């Protein structure tokens with residue numbers, strides 16, 4: 038009955054994201070990972086690549102599935118009969134910005150947002166910083182799942 | 195069967211707290227509001243008074259129950275077969291202190307914490323500020339459940 | 352006794368959050384000037400932005416609306432004033448605006464007064480309102496009634 | 508035209524950071540009242556705190572100093588005003604003061620204007636100044652000249 | 664020639680503090696850990712106990728020594744012919760508060776302060792939170808050095 | 821032999837930067853100021869111009885040298901036999917973003933970062949804001965080294 042959506046661009050998914058997925062899947066009957074695509078800007082990975090990397094690293098979460106979308110997150114959530122979003126947060130700065138979006142989403146669609154504190158070990162990994170570090174040759178193998186790391190290096194080379 | 199604990203002193207419960215209770219009860223199969231008994235610093239209302247005020251304000255939430263608790267919160271949570279805490283947050287500063295507690299609770303007992311952003315209208319209400327304003331004659335009736343407000347005036351006489 | 356402040360912004364479009372700040376500034380200063388930045392890529396033209404603000408502030412007799420360019424402190428000083436009034440939502444806002452406020456005081460002796468957002472508008476911004484409306488979300492409760500139909504026009 | 512604001516605090520003692528805020532408030536409002544809280548454990552008596560502020564604000568003709576108790580908004584409204592002016596150093600400050608500002612607006616319609624600290628006084632507070640002086644640190648550059656000798660008196 | 668002081672109450676020292684000590688000892692010729700004592704409030708551990716717990720967990724840092732003091736930190740620093748303080752920081756909130764003290768210390772004595780970001784794993788441990796959790800029976804064995812944990816449990820029992 | 825790298829674009833160097841350089845040079849045996857060459861986004865001054873402005877402003881710092889750098893900062897640092905970065909901080913928000921970078925740099929290369937709080941007088945100056953103010957005729961001469969100011973006026977004509 039209960040369910041939540043875990044949104045992001047996941048370009049690529051990180052171990053921080055996977056931690057959030059696992060924690061959501063432990064507390065809700067179903068979890069949908071929403072891979073939100075900007076039809077106007079391509080990321081590093083195509084939609085099918087992003088989804089494949091997430092599926093490979095969530096194979097042991099039976100109540101989680103992965104779907105892409107675009108436009109308003111609250112429409113994605115509501116069209117699946119749900120009304121909760123779960124998002125990871127690292128800092129107070131994160132909270133202030135995400136707060137605005139959560140209150141807007143509640144206002145326009147009645148959708149609630151639950152935030153979870155990042156695991157300490159992954160508090161400094163982000164998709165953007167991992168890509169930037171890897172671009173200039175830094176070692177990010179411990180911050181990304183196996184389903185991501187060598188595909189990332191491949192994209193960069 | 196999903197579930198979460200909503201902990202606090204609730205001295206007294208505010209409309210901000212109630213908003214959190216409602217949103218938790220909408221997303222989890224069971225919610226337990228845990229009312230802290232604090233041996234040292236006593237407050238304005240007894241634990242039984244606080245429990246009754248919450249029960250009156252949550253009468254329409256059939257999957258929410260109210261209980262007193264003492265000591266280590268994660269013991270309270272695990273003793274009831276649960277492993278999630280739900281708390282409301284108002285500010286970035288709130289997030290930083292609560293994040294420390296959440297990471298500590300996950301480390302020592304595997305209990306997770308979900309945070310929800312305050313409804314905008316209650317971003318500035320707290321039990322402590324409401325009591326202080328009311329003590330000096332300010333009108334806080336729009337910030338508290340109807341019953342709380344009547345009981346609060348009683349304690350002040 | 353010739354008190355006055357300037358309320359600056361791009362106002363693309365003006366929101367109820369902005370209007371709340373204008374009203375509060377107008378209640379505490381003899382003269383308020385809303386300064387609409389010309390910074391030519393926005394949704395509305397500078398003239399359209401000025402009109403929407405004038406429409407929404409008709410009940411504020413001591414407020415006027417003017418366009419401006421360049422250093423804000425020059426705009427303020429050339430009108431004989433030396434105060435800016437700005438609304439703030441978060442501590443993050445305060446830290447960024449703090450830098451600009453201290454710079455403005457340093458270079459021109461112009462002071463900045465910040466006012467806390469009304470709770471109901473803590474989450475509205477011109478940018479988020481435009482984004483939500485663009486994908487069909489209802490923002491009518493967040494914008495002046497006039498602005499709202501004008502926005503519908505730009506999209507449809 | 509009857510503009511006015513109240514600058515509240517314990518001022519135990521008043522610092523150059525506070526005085527900077529008083530001066531800036533006095534420059535932008537016709538009338539400024541400094542409200543000195545009676546909250547009986549401080550270092551100086553309410554009378555002493557009032558005297559130190561009056562001594563330091565002699566060049567501010569439109570400022571007066573009064574003691575107060577209870578709800579700040581009652582102090583403000585009973586003097587016919589509905590604005591508070593408060594200085595702010597950090598984003599953390601803003602978040603805490605934001606709650607009080609929104610509460611005060613809610614219960615009494617009293618607005619709050621915040622001003623950014625002068626950079627030179629970003630680190631001074633009554634409490635830190637007292638603490639440092641107590642252990643022999645030189646805080647003379649952080650306090651009004653009058654206050655400084657008075658502080659030396661309380662310690663020696 | 665170069666040197667820094669690492670101050671705190673260290674009541675007790677945590678793994679977060681030890682991380683800071685090690686990082687300071689790697690970058691300065693000498694490091695002094697300053698155990699600052701409030702002569703008006705006893706902590707959990709006496710001064711000699713605090714120093715002993717720090718020495719036992721820093722035995723492999725040859726350029727580090729431990730001394731107690733009270734009063735102005737900048738006097739402790741200057742009387743040893745030094746003029747740098749090194750302190751760990753976890754959050755932006757920490758930085759704002761410590762910033763005030765660092766600027767005051769520079770103002771009154773010319774002493775500089777260098778801050779270092781906490782290691783991610785210890786970002787949620789503090790002496791106060793470890794004591795509080797342990798008081799109510801929570802497991803904090805992974806957050807404190809061996810020189811501390813059982814002595815803490817002993818104090819509590 | 822202790823040492824640290826002070827990295828940045830310094831376009832142009834401000835009195836805030838110089839304060840950081842001075843404080844680093846006072847506490848480390850060697851300081852290297854690393855001036856970023858950025859292939860994409862160019863700025864107002866060439867790398868050689870930026871280096872010369874820093875050299876003129878740091879003429880009294882014999883243990884500080886200035887060099888251009890590109891790519892991964894921790895490679896620059898380790899290539900010079902060092903493993904410390906020193907950066908100035910103005911705000912809590914600054915700390916949060918820089919903390920992510922510092923933890924990342926420590927993770928991928930074992931390079932540590934020490935932060936110093938801005939002198940109060942320069943808390944509001946930045947290269948970007950100084951240029952913007954100067955472009956429209958504002959006087960920023962009290963915020964920049966004397967030589968920078970002369971060169972800045974030249975670029976604006």
Ligand SMILES: O=C(O)[C@@H](O)c1cccc(Oc2ccccc2)c1
Nearest residue numbers: 201202203228230263264265267270
């Ligand atoms: O008012 C507050 O928020 C705090 O006092 C607080 C924090 C965390 C939990 C709390 O309540 C309980 C703790 C342990 C067992 C049961 C309940 C109260």
Ligand SMILES: O=C(O)[C@@H](O)c1cccc(Oc2ccccc2)c1
Nearest residue numbers: 359360361386388419420421422423
């Ligand atoms: O929307 C905002 O807040 C910013 O874009 C901003 C900041 C400061 C001033 C602004 O408007 C003016 C600038 C210069 C002259 C006149 C007006 C706009």
Ligand SMILES: O=C(O)[C@@H](O)c1cccc(Oc2ccccc2)c1
Nearest residue numbers: 515516517542544575576577578579
């Ligand atoms: O020092 C401070 O900032 C606080 O102690 C503070 C906050 C708000 C008002 C204060 O002073 C008054 C309160 C009530 C009536 C009159 C004055 C003091």
Ligand SMILES: O=C(O)[C@@H](O)c1cccc(Oc2ccccc2)c1
Nearest residue numbers: 827828829854856889890891893896
């Ligand atoms: O202006 C800034 O602060 C950033 O652009 C920045 C951040 C970190 C390092 C930077 O400089 C270097 C990076 C790599 C090698 C050499 C120098 C610049």
